[PDB]
């Protein structure tokens, strides 16, 4: 269906310890595929998926240079933002930046984005059009006028509409046995109680990809908000992801409710009743 | 990564 590419950048200053901690990471959909960690030995952008390794050394050389240049610019930022925020040199601060591009099922551009946080909150962000800027507050407005004079927004649009989409397309057709292959969930049913009849049960999705899994509990006869409670989808650590939803039922014996599971990798949404 | 538009604040 739809796909995306996102790059996530995290820079954490260290009062003292000269060089801040820069960790950069690349995703197509829910699959990491490149990283950089300023702390590691290689000092290069490294692959984290089979299919990006195809790319030749020229690719890696330039991903490396750009990622390092990002790192040095967040380095400057940290100091500049201290100044704007009257902060001391002691105390560690966090600069974060994410950007990317979504495509629909025809693989054309839908939406592009570019955001920047400071100490965990919104500092400045490209609006939906790819030309105006939401700036949190005073300091952020000085960054805003600066980037407006420099036409940052049109540089980002060129990147986000074109390049980002062109490569996401390339990566989807290059990685096609990973990114386009669709693993339905495996399927459980768990009955919990205690030694006086008090029981709840939760249907399990396991080993599914991609990660969005809407999973419901059919009230035999209902109104259209209904009371389950679910853990957040969690990584299996290999390819896949896993998740469960729990609805509470009569303190003893009831087959009245049932699991509506719809996952893109699944022709028939998957009904399951309780049994051993 | 991006090549254009990336500036200090």
């Amino acid at each position: 269906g739809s796909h995306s590419m996102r790059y996530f950048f995290t820079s954490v200053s260290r009062p003292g310890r000269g060089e801040p901690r820069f960790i950069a990471v690349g995703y197509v959909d829910d699959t990491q595929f490149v990283r950089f960690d300023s702390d590691a030995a290689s000092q290069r952008m490294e692959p984290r998926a089979p299919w990006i390794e195809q790319e030749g050394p020229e690719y890696w050389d330039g991903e490396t240079r750009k990622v390092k240049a990002h790192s040095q610019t967040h380095r400057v930022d940290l100091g500049t933002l201290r100044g704007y925020y009257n902060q001391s040199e002691a105390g560690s601060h966090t600069v974060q930046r994410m950007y990317g591009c979504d495509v629909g099922s025809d693989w054309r551009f839908l939406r592009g984005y570019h955001q920047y946080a400071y100490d965990g909150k919104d500092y400045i962000a490209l609006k939906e059009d790819l030309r105006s800027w939401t700036a949190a507050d005073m300091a952020a407005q000085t960054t805003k006028h600066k980037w407006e004079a420099a036409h940052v927004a049109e540089q980002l649009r060129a990147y986000l509409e074109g390049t980002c989409v062109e490569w996401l397309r390339r990566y989807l057709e290059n990685g096609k046995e990973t990114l386009q292959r669709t693993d339905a969930p495996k399927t459980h049913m768990t009955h919990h109680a205690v030694s006086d009849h008090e029981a709840t049960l939760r249907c399990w999705a396991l080993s599914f990809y991609p990660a969005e899994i809407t999973l419901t509990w059919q009230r035999d006869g209902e109104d259209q908000t209904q009371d389950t409670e679910l853990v957040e989808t969690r990584p299996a650590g290999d390819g896949t992801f896993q998740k469960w939803a729990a609805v509470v039922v009569p303190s003893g014996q009831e087959q009245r409710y049932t699991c509506h599971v719809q996952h893109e990798g699944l022709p028939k949404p998957l009904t399951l009743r309780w049994e051993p | 990564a991006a090549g254009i538009g990336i500036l200090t604040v």
Partner: T-cell receptor
Amino acid sequence: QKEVEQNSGPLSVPEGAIASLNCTYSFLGSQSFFWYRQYSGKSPELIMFTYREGDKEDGRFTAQLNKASQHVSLLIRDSQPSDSATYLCAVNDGGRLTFGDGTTLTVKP
Amino acid sequence: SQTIHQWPATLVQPVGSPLSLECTVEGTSNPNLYWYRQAAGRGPQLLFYWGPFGQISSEVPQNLSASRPQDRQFILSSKKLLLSDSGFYLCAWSETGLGMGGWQFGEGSRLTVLE
């Protein structure tokens, strides 16, 4: 130069005519492009840059880009003899510029 | 009014002499700074690409190093110059980061190395 190809020249255009200079880059992932002028004995001087498909006009100069064919051009309207110079194409392949060896132009007065 | 001057302009030296070239930028802060070398008939080739906090890239030239004593001062040197080191040495800056500001070369330093 596999990475960035220009015809060498020398290429003559006559005073008043449009000189039209071409460039072909091979790095798929370039995101911005630059034209430089270089007079005999001097360091290159930046005529212009572009980061998007289509034409960019700065007075007598017009830069053009076609990502699909990885092609870049400069056009110089109403060529003067003092435009005789070597015109150097450059491609940003990530934090830096990579250059062709230039086409040398001669505007015969 | 950004600017970038390099020194010295022209040099004639024997094989094995040490080399020192200096470059200074003005009117911008924390610039990316570049050393390129240009041979007759050819385009500038990259030697060194430095961020404001240190080296990002080098095309690993034998017999040549770079350093950056100030933010705006940059330096190329060699311990014993080879003949092959003859060329047109050019310094450039770009505005901090990955963008379109800058990209100007100074006036270059021409080096001839004689046997």
